[PDB]
Design a protein around this motif. Structure first.
Motif, PDB file in Angstrom:
ATOM      1  N   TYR B   2      -9.911 -30.215  26.287  1.00 59.13           N
ATOM      2  CA  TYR B   2      -8.820 -30.956  25.689  1.00 59.13           C
ATOM      3  C   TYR B   2      -8.904 -30.755  24.183  1.00 59.13           C
ATOM      4  O   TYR B   2      -9.750 -30.002  23.708  1.00 59.13           O
ATOM      5  CB  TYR B   2      -8.974 -32.408  26.144  1.00 59.13           C
ATOM      6  N   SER B   5     -13.613 -33.290  22.666  1.00 52.24           N
ATOM      7  CA  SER B   5     -14.574 -33.523  23.730  1.00 52.24           C
ATOM      8  C   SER B   5     -15.453 -34.702  23.294  1.00 52.24           C
ATOM      9  O   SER B   5     -15.351 -35.171  22.173  1.00 52.24           O
ATOM     10  CB  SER B   5     -15.409 -32.270  23.939  1.00 52.24           C
ATOM     11  N   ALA B 188      -6.882 -42.043  24.985  1.00 58.15           N
ATOM     12  CA  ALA B 188      -7.458 -40.746  25.241  1.00 58.15           C
ATOM     13  C   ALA B 188      -8.902 -40.690  24.736  1.00 58.15           C
ATOM     14  O   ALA B 188      -9.789 -40.137  25.383  1.00 58.15           O
ATOM     15  CB  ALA B 188      -6.611 -39.660  24.576  1.00 58.15           C
ATOM     16  N   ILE B 192     -12.051 -39.979  27.238  1.00 61.94           N
ATOM     17  CA  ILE B 192     -13.013 -38.898  27.069  1.00 61.94           C
ATOM     18  C   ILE B 192     -14.439 -39.460  27.109  1.00 61.94           C
ATOM     19  O   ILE B 192     -15.349 -38.868  27.696  1.00 61.94           O
ATOM     20  CB  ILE B 192     -12.730 -38.138  25.754  1.00 61.94           C
ATOM     21  N   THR B 245      -2.536 -36.054  23.528  1.00 63.17           N
ATOM     22  CA  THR B 245      -3.161 -37.107  24.300  1.00 63.17           C
ATOM     23  C   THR B 245      -2.767 -37.044  25.768  1.00 63.17           C
ATOM     24  O   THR B 245      -3.596 -37.407  26.570  1.00 63.17           O
ATOM     25  CB  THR B 245      -2.923 -38.491  23.705  1.00 63.17           C
ATOM     26  N   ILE B 248      -5.283 -35.444  28.491  1.00 71.36           N
ATOM     27  CA  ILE B 248      -6.429 -36.349  28.664  1.00 71.36           C
ATOM     28  C   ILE B 248      -6.052 -37.524  29.553  1.00 71.36           C
ATOM     29  O   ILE B 248      -6.795 -37.912  30.460  1.00 71.36           O
ATOM     30  CB  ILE B 248      -7.030 -36.811  27.315  1.00 71.36           C
TER      31      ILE B 248
END
Ligand SMILES: OCc1ccc(-n2cnc3ccccc32)cc1
Ligand SMILES: *Cc1c(COP(=O)(O)O)cnc(C)c1O
Ligand SMILES: *Cc1c(COP(=O)(O)O)cnc(C)c1O
Ligand SMILES: [Ca+2]
Ligand SMILES: [Ca+2]
Ligand SMILES: [Ca+2]
Ligand SMILES: [Mg+2]
Lengths: 323, 322
Positions: B2, B5, B188, B192, B245, B248
């Motif tokens: 993405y 990270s 997001a 993550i 975003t 994610i």
């Protein structure tokens, strides 16, 4: 010596611990930046019932006897309808006993509704003290209850002192506690506790200038109650100090700081806006004290200061008015 | 992979931790009773500047570079006088650089005074999207400054993830996070972080049903922005989720709960009155989610739930209005 000892405060903490919150101590860079000092905020506005008075009220319910011949209270009675009456009702509910609040016929409808909504029963009296007294004594006697004074009852004073056990444990480097004062149950309980455990820590009272009996009593060296009912936005500190709290305050409180109505209001709004804590204006008194001009006389060695944010029982409508 | 990270969240944490608050997690007996769950409230309303946005803002100011010889920004430029702009302005103050806010010349005196109160420097533009953009571009370039997108900038998304790093330490047995979603930088970042560290922990989003692009996007499997700018009391979540975003959110967010305006208002007042925390309505979104009928059906195994109370920057006057 005094009407309570540190042993009584510890018996109170033991008695109430399983039913109250050990409220957090929060900080603010902004207030730290503003006052010169390193501030800690003991958050009794998050306490059960919305104020610290559950501590004294629950201690009284769990420690007082109605009579020589009966160990267990069968009801609680008080003339106080605000934070104390709310706390006392909740304490009574925890113990499965009824609560009665003695209320004048003349009280606002909103006061009558609020009492009923906290789960208490109302007993009416005339707006006179002869009536209020006749009525409460009748109720206490007929229900086999305990009358629980909001600030002069030693079991109450002992319970409010438990705030200071928590603060000392939570803020080991604390230099001073700042406590709003009305009847002085919280002040006196905290002063007993601090001076028993670590008397190098200062205990300071904060009071509205419009209701300055604790200041005038400490100035004069004897108990000088307000001659007339005070007018202040700090509605929870309209009581005068009394015969049980005054000797403690005279001997064990280091200093009193008085604050104007505007100071109380600005300090309240500052806490709302910059800390996001919904304190009642009464709890803004201690914050106004530390911001006040006279608090600049406090030694620079007194750096770590814990202010008791004593309650959060505020009505938004009563606010909209004075904001 | 993405636009960020977990490695980026860890970097952001090191970048920002010396300057932000490790905000407390508080609880409420009454709210536990109303939900049937053990709720934990991550108190970003106590964060510096009054919202979580200082995390992404500071990370961006400390990691983005201007278009100039000197690798450090010499200013920050923004279009925002809200939580984002306030956050960026504070970040600028920490770094000892000016913050400029581009303002249409026809802004009311009230807004201008309010802007200057938190310390931003006003530069005027004409009241069109063309002039707003061109003045900001000019200012950013002439000042050797940077601009920071409020939710799609990688450095911002990574900083917002630091919320979850703290929550997982502060509530080791947490079962779910509930996060209000607008542009989805906070959601997001959190997703993550959670899915990297303890992926059995659920990540739930909460948004107004009046601005339900996140719900619709997750249902459809594709980014479906709000067709029109939304009307909600939840001012801070009017943005739609964006291109950075969305992937994610698509992959790492377990579910989206929508709440009506009335639910938002009721949940906000409940928190004011029962918790004594002056949350803004946008922060009442996640509370409303956990109180909502749809949430009541969530498995009882999901017991320990952390709600992000994302901000407390509320105007007294507007509150009186509703
Ligand atoms: O500054 C925002 C702001 C909003 C509401 C208030 N407020 C005052 N009294 C209240 C009673 C209940 C709920 C909120 C209340 C204070 C501050
Ligand atoms: C009752 C009360 C006080 C005062 O305590 P006293 O023991 O009467 O001095 C202070 N703050 C609040 C919020 C109160 O309810
Ligand atoms: C910005 C903001 C949000 C939403 O964050 P996004 O990353 O835009 O989804 C939520 N609550 C508050 C208080 C905010 O300021
Ligand atoms: Ca007084
Ligand atoms: Ca990409
Ligand atoms: Ca949305
Ligand atoms: Mg005596």
């Amino acid at each position: 010596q005094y009407d309570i000892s540190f042993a009584d405060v510890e018996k109170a903490h033991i008695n109430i611990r399983d039913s109250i919150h050990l409220t957090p101590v929060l900080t603010s860079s902004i207030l730290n930046q503003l006052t010169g000092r390193n501030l800690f905020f003991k958050c009794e506005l998050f306490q059960k019932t919305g104020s610290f008075k559950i501590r004294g009220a629950l201690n009284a319910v769990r420690s007082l006897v109605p009579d020589a011949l009966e160990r267990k209270p069968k009801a609680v009675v008080t003339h106080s309808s605000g934070n104390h009456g709310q706390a006392l009702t909740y304490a009574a509910k925890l113990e499965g006993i009824p609560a009665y609040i003695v209320v004048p016929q003349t009280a606002p409808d909103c006061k009558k509704l609020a009492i009923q909504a906290y789960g208490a029963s109302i007993v009416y009296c005339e707006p006179s003290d002869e009536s209020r007294e006749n009525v409460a004594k009748r109720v206490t006697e007929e229900t086999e209850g305990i009358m629980v004074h909001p600030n002069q009852e030693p079991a109450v004073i002992a319970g409010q002192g438990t705030i200071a056990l928590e603060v000392l444990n939570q803020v080991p480097l604390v230099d001073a506690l700042v406590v709003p004062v009305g009847g002085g149950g919280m002040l006196a309980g905290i002063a007993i506790t601090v001076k028993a455990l670590k008397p190098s820590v200062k205990v300071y009272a904060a009071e509205p200038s419009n209701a300055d009996d604790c200041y005038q009593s400490k100035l004069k060296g004897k108990l000088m109650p307000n001659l007339y009912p005070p007018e202040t936005i700090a509605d929870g500190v309209k009581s005068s100090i009394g015969l049980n709290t005054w000797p403690i305050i005279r001997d064990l409180v280091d200093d009193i700081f008085t604050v104007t109505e505007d100071e109380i209001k600005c300090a309240t709004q500052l806490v709302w806006e910059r800390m996001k804590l919904l304190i009642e204006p009464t709890a803004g008194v201690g914050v106004a004290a530390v911001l006040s001009q006279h608090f600049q006389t406090v030694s620079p060695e007194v750096k770590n200061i814990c202010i008791v944010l004593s309650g959060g029982n505020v009505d938004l409508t009563s606010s909209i008015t004075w904001v």
